[PDB]
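Archive entry. Fields below.
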Amino acid sequence: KSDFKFSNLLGTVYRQGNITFSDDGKQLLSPVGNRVSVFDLINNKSFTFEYEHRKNIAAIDLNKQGTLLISIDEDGRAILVNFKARNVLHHFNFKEKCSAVKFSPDGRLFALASGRFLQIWKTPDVNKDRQFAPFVRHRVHAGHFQDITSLTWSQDSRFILTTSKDLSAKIWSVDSEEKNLAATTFNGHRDYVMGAFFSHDQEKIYTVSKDGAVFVWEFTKRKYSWRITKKHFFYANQAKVKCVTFHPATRLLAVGFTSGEFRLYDLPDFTLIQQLSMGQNPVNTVSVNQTGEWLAFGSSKLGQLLVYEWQSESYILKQQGHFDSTNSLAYSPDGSRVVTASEDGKIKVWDITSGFCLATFEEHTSSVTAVQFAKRGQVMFSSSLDGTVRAWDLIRYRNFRTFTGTERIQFNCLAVDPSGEVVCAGSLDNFDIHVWSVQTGQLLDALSGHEGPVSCLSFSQENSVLASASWDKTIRIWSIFGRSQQVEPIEVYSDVLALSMRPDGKEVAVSTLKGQISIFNIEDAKQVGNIDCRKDIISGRFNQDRFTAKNSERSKFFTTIHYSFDGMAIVAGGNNNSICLYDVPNEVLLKRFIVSRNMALNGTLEFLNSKKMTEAGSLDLIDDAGENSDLEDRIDNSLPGSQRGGDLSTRKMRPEVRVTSVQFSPTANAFAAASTEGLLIYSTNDTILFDPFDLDVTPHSTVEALREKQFLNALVMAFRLNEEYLINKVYEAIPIKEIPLVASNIPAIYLPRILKFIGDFAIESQHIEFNLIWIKALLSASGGYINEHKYLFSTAMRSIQRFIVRVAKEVVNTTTDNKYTYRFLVSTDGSM
Amino acid sequence: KNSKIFSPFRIIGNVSNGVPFATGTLGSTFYIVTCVGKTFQIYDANTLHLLFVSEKETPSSIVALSAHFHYVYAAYENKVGIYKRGIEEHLLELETDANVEHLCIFGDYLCASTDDNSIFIYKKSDPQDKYPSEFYTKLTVTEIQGGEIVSLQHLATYLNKLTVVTKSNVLLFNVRTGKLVFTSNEFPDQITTAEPAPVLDIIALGTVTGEVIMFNMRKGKRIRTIKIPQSRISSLSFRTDGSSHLSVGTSSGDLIFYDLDRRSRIHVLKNIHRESYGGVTQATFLNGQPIIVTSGGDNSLKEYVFDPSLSQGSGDVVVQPPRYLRSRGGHSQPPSYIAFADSQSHFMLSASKDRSLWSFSLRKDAQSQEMSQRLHKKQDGGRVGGSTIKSKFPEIVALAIENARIGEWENIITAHKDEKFARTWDMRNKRVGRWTFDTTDDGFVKSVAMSQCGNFGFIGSSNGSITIYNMQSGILRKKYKLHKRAVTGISLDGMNRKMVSCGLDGIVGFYDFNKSTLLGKLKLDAPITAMVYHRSSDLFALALDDLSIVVIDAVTQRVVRQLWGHSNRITAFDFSPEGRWIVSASLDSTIRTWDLPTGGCIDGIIVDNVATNVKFSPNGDLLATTHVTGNGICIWTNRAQFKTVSTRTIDESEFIDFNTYTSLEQIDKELLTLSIGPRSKMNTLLHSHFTKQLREGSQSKDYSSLLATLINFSPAAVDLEIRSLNSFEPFDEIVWFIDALTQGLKSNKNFELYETFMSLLFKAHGDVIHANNKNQDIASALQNWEDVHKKEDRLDDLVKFCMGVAAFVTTA
RNA sequence: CAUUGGUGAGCAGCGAAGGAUUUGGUGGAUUACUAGCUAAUAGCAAUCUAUUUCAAAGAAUUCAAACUUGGGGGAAUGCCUUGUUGAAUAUUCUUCAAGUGUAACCUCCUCUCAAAUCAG
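PREDICTED_STRUCTURE:
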């Protein structure tokens, strides 16, 4: 009820770095602002890892088999992640800016393109325990003149070639005794060689440069070595390459041009399959599978991802998020639905497990600000600075009726009665609470009495009276029913905003400018008690701040407050790095949460590093966009004083760490907050962290573990084999004294398998008590996994309660029958 | 001895130990290789950043350290490690059982001496090769040649000449041949330290007297001498920077600096290293730089520089004294109490009998910084009480820290030795803060903990009073009196509502914190030595003198679990991050690990050392032990966060072909089982040689023969078998068959069937027993039926429980 | 009288071989530690020079190439474009016009404000 852990980050589908699929084409790895998201395409689910990076990610790969994940910052922070286990194994620091990490197809060793250096390291072992210094640098190849921009292995591990912004594209081996076999360099291009490749046969070499050129290198005659047999030019006129991949087993080039165009070729032939305009915005990364039938693009001009097939004209996902523009967030009464609004207008509909915008609504023209659900999560509304509140349903996914005012006025916040007629909106301009009927587009009442803006509004779940927040430091509670049209002010003394009611509707959380949240009675007028937030808020000092965070007034209030589903807790969130969980009656915060730990995010750090405070100025506040190799990144369009305006590049600043919208789940007390980075999910759904067991097996290994007394691990080694002789060996082998010791430590992966094995075998078995202890220990062990996914165990549990009643409770009814006949026949008397 | 849940990662918090460290160069720059027991460390000299650690703990402690350019040569017991980058590339195990004393590197050779007064020679397999792997020979020093081998050095421009110095004299060898090319005469003092020289031919020797001898070999003569009054020399070094300067390191901690041209000492440093821990253990000028790196046995490694000379006209005469430069220190004594400071497992507080805190950083070994003990100028104005010879704070027995309001006031409370109060410290300012918190009943502070709101520190006296001081102004709030013995562990709940305390009276007191009432008072058996609380899950654990940790629920106001199982005084113990486990360590050299939902010791680590403090990280990753010897903090990776391990009760015992399997009939005798085959027999039955065999089982008063064919009797024939029971007066075959059934349920197999036979008795002779109710013969056997019968409600307690849980879990 | 003002005397009071203040310099952290240099599989680090050089590999928009300009005018003189003229050998160059042609080249704007003062 207190312990909330990070579960999943949603959206902002690409910022910076390399995109990769796994061994299988299911798992797609993308960078987020500092995290890695994994999108599984067929089993449509999304995931983002529990950790974050310290700067923006500029390099990424995963293992051959999907065991290790390497994320590397812009600076060269490297993070070793147990990819199957989602836990961080090692933080190494590469001291140079690297651009490419690629594992071996062997999986034995990976390599790194940092500067003009190639660093080739051995892989750390996953089944081995975590060590202090796991990484062993095998070799370092520094035969390059400028920064090495692209890098590949062969399909054998024994050949690696890298390419730089220097003209060179150079092959070596892993091992130096394989140096003499092939160790040479390629030149003769015009420009940045942006990608050089082996073919699927290791005899043809493809080298692609920025100018639009490919050479077909081949170890051929006029001993004799390595001529160009042909060149290939796509003849892009002013456009030039940004990114290039090559799928070798089908001989396919994916190109990304500066003009947002992209081409496909068949490389011994060099024949144009199709040209797609991905957009105005260039492909910043291309990717193929080992199957080579999906392609993955990312535009870091927009922040979009695109999985599209080359052979069939068909996308998989065309996802386009919006940074700094996650305005509203909305839990449904159902715990399966989530609504995110935006300043661009898009209002997306997410599942919490499968993190996909299932729906969107791109019909608002301006910023959408406040969204509440009503009537069992059927209808869902959207007040806007677009001058309207547009209604939305979750069955037809359509606009119902765009409630309008007179003078086309923007609307600050939205409140919906559960009785689905009454929708109130407060305005940032007009400061009159407009009440719309849902059935009639006319306004029901123009509630007047706000001097300065109406900040926020909510109704009770109980009496459905509304509480609006002035900027005149004064709550106005309106009771519009019983034909009174009656009002009451509550004077606060400092400037309130972000109002939030208890579900009982007799107490209200208020956030003043002091940070002090107050709780107000509604059946009476006085203040109940007030909890302080100006002390326990993590605020950040910007690099351009000229005052320390201890006496900074940047973010020590709260831009959103929410009551818990008992009404006994509150999660509040503001323009800070800090999200807070106060207890309502005990009146002291339970836990304080970071939203994001990113140096490029501005107000993350409490204390700035004094090595960056130079003579006159920061060390980072110097304009470094003027040194980019590309003209477009050297172009500055930043208008000076734009605060949360349209695009990212036009702040002329780092993005502030701010969290706009905060809500609780009804069911499992999970709270989600749409941040600057995107929607974050904290939950109490603990042990959804997926945990592989006993990773590489014989039947002898589990049976030797029976001889080795390693009985839970022997059960795992049996259940990976799935032969019922072994399961009845290992099942009756463990003693009773460690049955609940075993069953609480069973993963959820074999949970329907073990529940079905118990549910089937125990029906015909004499070990009724022994099976019964297993079902007791399992249902007391991990019944919560059957609380969430009921249809997952529905076949197994059916057999289980077949065994409980027909097989076991028949024996019990026999027992109680003979018992009660004993009690009668020994407690009563005779005759004669 | 091996752990399954945790594993050793490194011993955090150590810089050196006193073993003479080695210096090396990469190109222009310098690295330093020091020893910590069985694990060596490498440093840049220009920042004292940690560069490498050993890939393995060595099986015995490293005795010697030498270092060439990329290869660091460690020397433990019989074997010598050739390490590149802290990784064992080549172990050279010497062909004695004598212990390796000293070591040196020159040419294509390696030379290492043992304590059998014999040096071993190890050639490179080629000059093309880089590390020496070929075993050349063993030469020795017999007691006409020299004494006990103090050092092996190679003075430069000496072709294959090995300079072996003893307590007596100096020898020179051709290690290609193996011939003693020269023996020096005895110096009359006991030679203790050698050092080569940037001049030719000279070896400097610092003896057991305060005497340093410059000694030639081309002369064979002791060219100059240098005296020291009443100090035992430990290290010698030469400043090769550009003025001829000599470094004399005592074992009294003092460092003496000479200029041999002016024939004068320059400055003597006093007490740069602790005298009791070996004095100055090794000091060495970095070659061609005015920087001397000193290393003490107080887990400390300092740097000093000569400033360039102020005299423009002179230079060499006017010398600035050496000046403090960067240093990595550790706890000189072993650490008494540790804790995990932050939430993200970045910092650990470690307090020792060195009388100091240290704020170690498990992220980066250089952010590890010693805390200040500098009092704020007292807010009253009247002056404070203490000696003007300001001593360190007395060593600490308890620690307390909450990072809720960090850096707005103090948030570290430390219970010093034999002080009536306990000081407060800012974690952020790395310095003891303004308030000190008293007992106000004139007893010692014996346990402290702080409020999670960061506003209260709780202080438990040796006379029982618990004071609640405020972290705002240092003011007290309430002084609770429950215990008349000592308090020994305090806590608050995570909501700051209900506070617990454990005492040396055997009382755990439940008080409210918002309210002021004593809510509950649980009396445990032995007095209660410590208290650990889990804020996320509202439990609290305690060690008592009954060698066993009781975990007490704070809601249900009673014991939830007690782990018996230890063998001695339980030193430290800790919950998990999530309350699933408790790590305990006791004086029994065991560190056991407990799964509290069940309550079984699921692994215990046997250690060579006694583990004093264990500390589970708030993150689910790290376990910190501190031992009784050893000054660092053993960090342990938690494998459960990575894959898993087994959870068995296996501690006290230490401390196929046909791919098919027939079922076991009965696993243990205590469990109940049914009849092999059809379950439908109950549904059938419920919807003479026989009586002779029943008699022959009755005369045994064991009826195990009857039950066999009783299962195997055809179900319709039993409808005449029980309907002929021969009992009108004696009721024998009634009592014979009923006791046959009760002996049938005794082995618990075919449990349902004897119930069916009992109900078939009621179908057959319920009137024959009923009209003769009160008869003490059949009533005895039915009393025996109830006594055997009353255990098996445990499956009715299983079936109803498991059924309701199944329905409740499917529906909700 | 409150001084709740400090000076000023003092005293109770605190109080271990001083107390209080102010500042210079330097070091340590202020992101999570795998060593320096080079031509880099290796050599160096007292040195790469009297093997560093031969060798191979290595040349498209047949000239795509201001993605970049404060806004108006014009744009004489330049340039661009085609129209058009001559010369040389299928192309440059001489000559010439038409261009609400033009980041060359000419001007107008991109200063005068409920800021304050001042007579009425």
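CURATOR_NOTE: The helical segments of chain A are 631-634, 699-707, 711-719, 724-731, 739-743, 751-761, 768-788, 794-827.
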